[PDB]
Write an enzyme that holds these catalytic residues in place. Structure first.
Site, PDB file in Angstrom:
ATOM      1  N   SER A  76       0.844  -1.201   0.000  1.00 23.05           N
ATOM      2  CA  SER A  76       0.000   0.000   0.000  1.00 23.05           C
ATOM      3  C   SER A  76       0.878   1.249   0.000  1.00 23.05           C
ATOM      4  CB  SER A  76      -1.006  -0.101   1.129  1.00 23.05           C
ATOM      5  OG  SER A  76      -2.106   0.738   0.831  1.00 23.05           O
ATOM      6  N   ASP A 132      -9.282  -4.968  -4.987  1.00 23.09           N
ATOM      7  CA  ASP A 132      -8.770  -3.975  -4.053  1.00 23.09           C
ATOM      8  C   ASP A 132      -9.582  -2.695  -4.170  1.00 23.09           C
ATOM      9  OD1 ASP A 132      -7.231  -2.046  -2.652  1.00 23.09           O
ATOM     10  OD2 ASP A 132      -5.393  -3.240  -3.047  1.00 23.09           O
ATOM     11  N   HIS A 155      -7.594  -5.780  -0.174  1.00 27.50           N
ATOM     12  CA  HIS A 155      -6.393  -4.982   0.072  1.00 27.50           C
ATOM     13  C   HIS A 155      -5.562  -5.497   1.252  1.00 27.50           C
ATOM     14  CE1 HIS A 155      -3.884  -1.471  -0.206  1.00 27.50           C
ATOM     15  NE2 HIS A 155      -4.088  -1.210   1.075  1.00 27.50           N
TER      16      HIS A 155
END
Length: 184
Positions: A76, A132, A155
Site C-alpha cells: 500500500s 482492491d 487490500h
C-alpha cells in the site's frame, strides 16, 4: 544468498502486518533474522515523514549486515514511500529487488525507477488485485515493471494470500523487471 529484506507497511499498518509473509519466506529458505520490518510513526504514511525514516532504517540494515543491497516488500502506501526513497532521497543505490502489494506507487512515479547504480538496476514486481477497493490498480501499475494482476483478494488480504506469496518469492529471487533503461 538472499539480500536482507526490508518490509514496508502501509497507512495505518504495523510491522506485524508482515507476520504471514515472514513465516512463508522462512518456509522457502529465507532466514527469519534477515527479514527487517519497519514501524512508521505517521498514521497516514506521508512521504515527508516515512521517506527519511525508511532511509535511516535501510542504512542501518546495510551497516550491520554488511550486505551491499536490500530487497523490499512493500504494502500500500509503503510502495509510495519506497519509490519516494529511491526518487527523492538516497535509496537509488541501496535496493535490488522490489515487490509491491497494492502499492500506491503512482503517487511518486508512473514508471519503475531504475535507481542510481549502473551495475544493477532496481527490479520491480507490482502485484495488485482487481478486488482492491483501497488502492486502484492504475495507481499500482508501473511502466516498465513486471505488473501482476490477481483477482478476489482484498487490500489487507494481500498480506496473507498464497498467490501473492508465490509472486513475492519470484520477485525476491530476481523475477521482477525494469525495461526503462532500454529504448522503447
Amino acid at each position: 544468498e538472499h539480500n536482507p529484506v526490508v518490509m514496508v507497511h502501509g497507512m495505518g499498518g504495523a510491522s506485524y502486518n508482515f507476520a504471514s509473509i515472514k513465516s512463508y519466506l522462512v518456509t522457502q529458505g529465507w532466514d527469519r533474522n534477515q527479514l527487517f520490518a519497519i514501524d512508521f510513526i505517521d498514521k497516514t504514511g506521508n512521504n515527508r515523514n516515512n521517506g527519511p525514516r525508511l532511509s535511516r532504517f535501510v542504512k542501518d540494515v546495510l551497516g550491520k549486515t554488511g550486505a551491499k543491497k536490500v530487497d523490499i516488500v512493500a504494502h500500500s502506501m509503503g510502495g509510495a514511500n519506497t519509490l519516494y526513497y529511491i526518487k527523492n532521497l538516497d535509496g537509488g543505490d541501496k535496493i535490488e529487488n522490489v515487490v509491491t502489494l497494492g502499492g500506491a506507487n503512482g503517487l511518486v512515479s508512473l514508471r519503475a525507477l531504475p535507481g542510481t547504480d549502473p551495475n544493477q538496476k532496481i527490479l520491480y514486481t507490482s502485484v495488485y488485485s482487481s478486488a482492491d477497493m483501497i488502492v486502484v490498480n492504475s495507481l499500482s501499475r508501473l511502466i516498465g515493471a513486471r505488473n501482476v494482476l490477481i483477482h478476489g483478494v482484498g487490500h489487507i488480504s494481500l498480506l496473507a494470500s498464497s498467490q501473492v506469496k508465490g509472486y513475492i518469492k519470484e520477485g525476491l529471487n530476481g523475477g521482477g523487471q525494469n525495461t526503462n533503461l532500454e529504448h522503447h
